[PDB]
């Protein structure tokens, strides 16, 4: 099913966190059945993870940064399953950029000298453009900050067309258009409190917000009604 033939391009050792916290290969290849992309996550040869029908499967595809980890960066996808059962479907994995330019520079997909890793993020875009999917890099407008969600410490990543909240379980992920209101509130001197509540009636609480980041996102959720 897979073979060298069919692969368009495979990435040992990834970081896996979501659905599941394990090193694997990901590998963007070409079906025999229908020669159709696929992408799936390997232990071995075993598959942990598979998404087909990427042009119409895959929701939403972003390169994010990993807060004081310039080392790191995420790839989070979310995708309607091969079997078109379930919906909306998150996973995260981080690339260490180091490890993936000399991934690179030994497939000689990046001449030995090669410096900058947002050639392999340009590679990598490039492989989902053929591949009939688009990977957004929001990054390099959008922001992202630290709170809290009652005692645990999360990231607020504030996109084009969603708000995230990663990435220990649960992952929460709104459409921007679904956001009702947002209430400001404090507890501390030097942070302030928000209260979200979404168009289905669900009320999310994140706290300690750092109050140099109420500018933006007051000014985001007035953008986006
Ligand atoms: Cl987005």
Not at 182 to 193: G, H, M, V
Not at 202 to 223: G, H, P
């Amino acid at each position: 099913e897979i073979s060298e033939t069919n692969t368009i391009f495979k990435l040992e050792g990834v970081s896996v966190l979501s659905p599941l916290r394990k090193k694997l290969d990901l590998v963007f290849y070409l079906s025999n059945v229908d020669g159709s992309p696929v992408i799936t996550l390997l232990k071995g040869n075993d598959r942990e993870l598979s998404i087909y029908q990427l042009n119409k499967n895959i929701k939403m595809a972003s390169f994010l940064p990993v807060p004081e980890k310039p080392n790191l960066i995420y790839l989070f996808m979310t995708y309607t399953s091969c079997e078109d059962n379930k919906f909306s479907e998150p996973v995260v994995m981080t690339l260490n950029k180091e490890n993936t330019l000399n991934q690179f520079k030994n497939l000689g997909l990046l001449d030995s000298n090669v410096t900058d890793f947002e050639k392999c993020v340009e590679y990598i875009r490039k492989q989902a453009i053929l591949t009939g999917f688009k990977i957004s890099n929001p990054f390099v407008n959008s922001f992202h900050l630290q709170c809290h969600r009652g005692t645990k410490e999360g990231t607020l990543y504030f996109l084009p067309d969603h708000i995230i909240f990663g990435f220990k379980k649960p992952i929460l992920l709104f459409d921007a258009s679904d956001i009702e209101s947002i209430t400001y509130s404090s507890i501390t001197r030097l942070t302030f409190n928000a209260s979200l509540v979404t168009k289905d009636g669900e009320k999310y609480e994140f706290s300690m917000t750092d109050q140099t980041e109420y500018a933006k996102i007051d000014d985001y959720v007035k953008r986006k009604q």
